[PDB]
Design a protein around this nucleic acid. Structure first.
Ligand SMILES: [Mg+2]
Ligand SMILES: [Mg+2]
Length: 89
DNA sequence: TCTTAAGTAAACAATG
DNA sequence: ACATTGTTTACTTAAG
């Protein structure tokens, strides 16, 4: 990991959850998927975690689920994330 | 232009 | 006593 990913935090989260076996992921698990699949953030300046939690709460695309709690993709905005994913892969 | 997405920092409350 | 998690405001840059 030497360069910043071309994907935005919204897409990284979407790729992490979508790769999950159940489309549901706690925050810390989302951290890992971003690290394992993107090692740039290993040496990246602290704050991307913050930017992640910031992105999960106000982005209409993600909705919490409580029966840390799990995050999932919103079915009505899922089409929105895929489009941004195809743009710059 | 008017608008919105996006990144980052910072400040908390709620959580266990 | 504490780190994690979650919400909120604020200033900035790029894109359309
Ligand atoms: Mg959300
Ligand atoms: Mg930017």
């Amino acid at each position: 990991g030497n360069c910043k990913p071309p994907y935005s935090f919204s897409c990284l989260i979407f790729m992490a959850i979508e790769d999950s076996p159940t489309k549901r992921l706690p925050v810390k698990d989302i951290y890992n998927w971003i690290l394992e699949h993107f090692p740039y953030f290993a040496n990246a300046p602290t704050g991307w975690k913050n930017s992640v939690r910031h992105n999960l709460s106000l982005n209409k695309c993600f909705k919490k689920v409580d029966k840390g709690s799990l995050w999932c993709i919103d079915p009505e905005y899922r089409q929105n994330l895929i489009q941004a994913l195809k743009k710059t892969p």
